[PDB]
């Protein structure tokens, strides 16, 4: 319930730019690739949403 809730709204951005019609296996890769290396380290509105969600939950 902790990391399941916050993860869903990240995929709303992925469906808008690329498309919801892409495969589910491709969305898992697109979701993981952004979250992995921004943590460890209309484009403006989407980046502001992403940085708050990277802050939440455990990730290395």
UniProtKB/Swiss-Prot annotation:
Name of the molecule in the record: Pre-mRNA-splicing helicase BRR2
Entry's localization field: Nucleus
Note: Present with 1440 molecules/cell in log phase SD medium.
UniProt record similarity statement: Belongs to the helicase family. SKI2 subfamily.
Biological role: RNA helicase that plays an essential role in pre-mRNA splicing as component of the U5 snRNP and U4/U6-U5 tri-snRNP complexes. Involved in spliceosome assembly, activation and disassembly. Mediates changes in the dynamic network of RNA-RNA interactions in the spliceosome. Catalyzes the ATP-dependent unwinding of U4/U6 RNA duplices, an essential step in the assembly of a catalytically active spliceosome.
Residue stretches in coiled coil: none
Lineage: superkingdom: Eukaryota
Oligomer status and interactors: Component of the U4/U6-U5 tri-snRNP complex composed of the U4, U6 and U5 snRNAs and at least PRP3, PRP4, PRP6, PRP8, PRP18, PRP31, PRP38, SNU13, SNU23, SNU66, SNU114, SPP381, SMB1, SMD1, SMD2, SMD3, SMX2, SMX3, LSM2, LSM3, LSM4, LSM5, LSM6, LSM7, LSM8, BRR2 and DIB1. Interaction with PRP8 is important for recruitment to the U4/U6-U5 tri-snRNP complex.
Domain-related comment: Contains two helicase domains. The N-terminal helicase domain has catalytic activity by itself, contrary to the C-terminal helicase domain that may have a regulatory role and enhance the activity of the first helicase domain.
